[PDB]
Design a binder for this molecule. Structure first.
Ligand SMILES: [Mg+2]
Ligand SMILES: [Mg+2]
Ligand SMILES: [Mg+2]
Ligand SMILES: [Mg+2]
Ligand SMILES: [Mg+2]
Ligand SMILES: [Mg+2]
Ligand SMILES: [Mg+2]
Ligand SMILES: [Mg+2]
Ligand SMILES: [Mg+2]
Ligand SMILES: [Mg+2]
Ligand SMILES: [Mg+2]
Lengths: 65, 214, 149, 135, 64
RNA sequence: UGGAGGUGAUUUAAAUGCCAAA
RNA sequence: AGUCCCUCCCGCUCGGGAGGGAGGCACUCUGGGGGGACUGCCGGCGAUAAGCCGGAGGAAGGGGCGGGCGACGGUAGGUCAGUAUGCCCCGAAACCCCCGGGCUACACGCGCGCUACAAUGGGCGGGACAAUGGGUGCCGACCCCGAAAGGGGGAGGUAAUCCCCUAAACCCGCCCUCAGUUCGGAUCGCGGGCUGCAACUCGCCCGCGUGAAGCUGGAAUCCCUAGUACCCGCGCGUCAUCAUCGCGC
């Protein structure tokens, strides 16, 4: 309902039609899946140590090269 | 009109505009915490020295960010509430004294109506107006489709501030309300999750559309 | 206390009030019907604008003297709206300023320095500084930092 | 009978400040600093004095002569000159680091100047250009 | 990009071979020495040459 | 290093060349 | 700026101001010479090379920032209506002067702009702060006359000296309160001026009156990465007079 905080640990690379999306790896900080590491797509500038708020934690982005 | 004690006001402590302290203001959202800057500062005017460096806007006091956001025309090349708003020669572009006065009067109104520290109410508004999920576009067969993605905290803050400023701008255009009153109304409504606020409705719509395209 | 210690507009208001007791300051006969410059649009709305203009001119002479008609004509000009053409700066007219300066001299507040302009006589300097002192005494009751000056 | 003089510059505005022992009077071109308008310009000048504190504030007198530039450019040059005078007069290094934490520009200045204009709508700016049409 | 220029490299290598025991790992010393041992008249070129010679000295002192 | 084969796939629509050259 | 002499003001003067004279080159400025930044220092990646990424110190950091300078050639691109020039023509008219007209016409299509459609305002009174340039066929302070536009005298200046030259956006007080209006100022009537040999065709300025369309703009589409874009005025070129332009501030 209020989402789950996750923390950025690694930057993978840019993607998207116009290069506007970045793929990152995050570690969940709260909820049922605390501690798990999954990769995600993020819009906007981001750096290591940022914290995202996820509305769901069972979708994982397709790996890029 | 304005009493002489206000025309010639002299401070003695480092506090926002010499009138409000920000020591008891706290931020609930864990993601926005390291991006809302609340260090003590007297004058919110830094002369644009932060635009050169990457991530440099992080260490700019939040009141100055609001002042910069409202220093605009408002509806140049996209429509807001169904209209272009082209003011041109009668806009606030590069007039930072008038924007400062507008923000000050809005803060006084907020303090009068709700009895709380105006910075706290502003923080609540930007917390409630920051979206958490966005979308990107792809093209197939000559048709455009949406794909849901996540938002970084800096972009969340930027979008929230822009939407608040746009709502205030739309409420005073060719109506009897003044700019300071519209800004106060918008901030109060966003702080109470009222759908009549432009920013809150925009956030709801963005999140709904993102959800319907996972 | 001197003129340099108080805001200009407040001093001008007090001086304009005070100038109504001096018999040599009387607005001319054409005063009801004129604008104060070609860049204006409508006539003055105060029924006693003459005294305000005279007080402003006296304070002007106190601060920048010696000074002549032409430079004051520059000071009282401004921006003009020109229909479909872009706005432009223009000077003011000369009759108001000349007549005001002659009346001020007749009252003994200014005198003429040949080839240079007009300067404030000791009487006029005392006249302005007295009002400045009174205004400062009033003002420092609500701005305690003004007591040092 | 100490006297110290300092200089500040900000986009064509130049300020010269003189500091000496006194009772706490600060003047800008002969006007008391409490009557400077508008408000956003008054707070620009007063920041170093507030940071220094009332004990140091009330034990000096400062006179500042400033020319050129505009109303916002003149206030910032005066602020630079006053900050430099304060750090030189008292010569304490706790204050110098305190100024730098709050605002570095108080002591190192601002080197930005206008960029000269270029053709193709030269009167508007070096980079603004005329609207382009194809038919 | 900060790509070193060809003639800077050539003159610096000539200087290093001919007077091996004249330059140290210090930039100021090499600056003065280069100023005296050549007819270079530009201040900027002199700095480029001295910097490259300093790198050569530290690299050969390491033994590559 | 340079070659020869095999199996899979390959995201809407998109026709034409006039004044000239003389 | 400090020190000294005189004069004039305020709370009557302990104190605080303003002019003038001696006097000085401190500070600003002007302009000759010199210093300073080199991937030089530190930690990573790459190959241990070329280099790249991130830090200190620093006025400045990685072509430090903005400009000048455009290779061999092509475009049968523009220019013989700037000047130079071959051929062909006119050569008592296609050469040279003078007078009056035109290039300024007006059902209509298009480019680039300016003024607006108002309160992120309109008006009236008052208060603030620039830079670039230019001046003897000229810049003109200062005095007088006139409601204004302007008129009559006229110091100084061949100019870091005299003059153009006390910008506007901005700030304070009062009136108007969402309306085709105290928004807008097109069009037209009457009267007064300046330049010029000449103002009708066909110039610019001022006063009173008059008061059009316009209530934010379809499909489309342009410019811009930092003292940049937007907003605001000013100088020079052109120039007897005339700037909604060009180049700069
Ligand atoms: Mg004015
Ligand atoms: Mg207008
Ligand atoms: Mg510019
Ligand atoms: Mg074809
Ligand atoms: Mg050709
Ligand atoms: Mg051709
Ligand atoms: Mg034509
Ligand atoms: Mg009007
Ligand atoms: Mg005619
Ligand atoms: Mg309307
Ligand atoms: Mg032209």
């Amino acid at each position: 309902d209020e989402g789950y905080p996750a923390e950025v640990i690694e930057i993978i690379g840019r993607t998207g039609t116009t290069g506007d999306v970045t793929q990152v790896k995050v570690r969940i900080l709260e909820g049922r899946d605390k501690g798990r590491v999954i990769r995600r797509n993020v819009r906007g500038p981001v750096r290591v140590g940022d914290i995202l708020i996820l509305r769901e934690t069972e979708r994982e982005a397709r790996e890029i090269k | 009109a304005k009493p002489l004690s206000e025309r010639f006001f002299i401070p003695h402590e480092i506090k926002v505009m010499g009138r409000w302290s920000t020591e008891d203001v706290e931020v609930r959202d864990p993601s926005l915490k390291p991006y809302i800057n609340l260090e003590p500062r007297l004058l919110p005017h830094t002369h644009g020295r932060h635009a050169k460096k990457h991530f440099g806007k992080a260490n700019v006091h939040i009141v100055e960010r609001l002042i910069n956001k409202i220093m605009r025309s408002g509806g140049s090349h996209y429509k807001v509430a169904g209209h272009f708003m082209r003011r041109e020669h009668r806009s606030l572009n590069s007039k930072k004294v008038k924007a400062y006065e507008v923000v000050k009067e809005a803060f006084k109104i907020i303090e009068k109506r709700t009895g709380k520290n105006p910075i706290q109410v502003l923080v609540w508004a930007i917390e409630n107006a920051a979206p958490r999920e966005d979308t990107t576009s792809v093209m197939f067969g000559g048709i455009r489709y949406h794909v849901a993605v996540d938002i970084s905290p800096m972009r969340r803050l930027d979008v929230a501030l822009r939407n608040i400023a746009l709502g205030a701008s739309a409420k005073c255009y060719r109506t009897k309300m003044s700019f300071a009153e519209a800004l106060a109304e918008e901030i109060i409504l966003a702080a109470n999750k009222d759908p009549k606020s432009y920013a809150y409705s925009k956030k709801l719509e963005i999140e709904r559309i993102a959800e319907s395209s996972r | 206390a001197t003129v340099y210690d108080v805001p200009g507009d407040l001093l001008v208001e007090r001086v304009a009030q005070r100038l109504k007791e001096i018999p040599e300051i009387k607005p001319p006969e054409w005063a009801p019907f004129v604008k104060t410059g070609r860049h204006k649009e409508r006539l003055p709305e105060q029924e006693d604008w003459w005294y305000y203009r005279v007080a402003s001119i006296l304070r002007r002479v106190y601060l920048d003297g010696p000074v002549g008609i032409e430079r004051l004509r520059t000071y009282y000009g401004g921006r003009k709206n020109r229909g479909h053409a872009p706005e432009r700066f223009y000077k003011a007219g000369g009759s108001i300023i000349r007549k005001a300066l002659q009346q001020l001299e007749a009252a003994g507040f200014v005198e003429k320095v040949p080839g240079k302009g007009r300067v404030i006589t000791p009487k006029g300097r005392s006249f302005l500084d007295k009002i400045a002192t009174e205004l400062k005494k009033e003002l420092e009751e609500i701005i305690p930092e003004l007591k040092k000056y | 009978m100490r006297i110290i003089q300092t200089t500040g510059k900000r986009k064509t505005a130049i300020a010269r400040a003189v500091i000496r022992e006194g009772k706490g009077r600060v003047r800008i071109n002969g006007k008391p600093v409490e009557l400077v308008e508008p408000e956003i310009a008054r707070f620009t000048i007063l920041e170093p004095l507030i940071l220094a504190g009332e004990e140091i504030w009330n034990s000096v007198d400062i006179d500042v002569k400033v020319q050129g530039g505009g109303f916002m450019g003149q206030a910032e040059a005066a602020r630079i000159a006053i900050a430099r005078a304060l750090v030189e007069w008292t010569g304490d290094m706790n204050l110098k680091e305190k100024f730098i934490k709050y605002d570095r520009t108080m002591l190192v200045g601002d080197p930005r100047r206008t960029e000269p204009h270029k053709p193709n709508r030269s009167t508007k700016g070096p980079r603004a250009k005329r609207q382009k049409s194809y038919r | 990009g900060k790509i070193r220029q060809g003639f800077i490299k050539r003159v610096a290598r000539e200087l290093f071979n001919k007077y091996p025991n004249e330059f140290t790992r210090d930039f100021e010393h090499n600056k003065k020495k280069v100023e005296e041992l050549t007819n270079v008249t530009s201040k900027k070129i002199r700095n480029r040459i001295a910097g490259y010679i300093t790198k050569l000295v530290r690299m050969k002192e390491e033994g590559k």
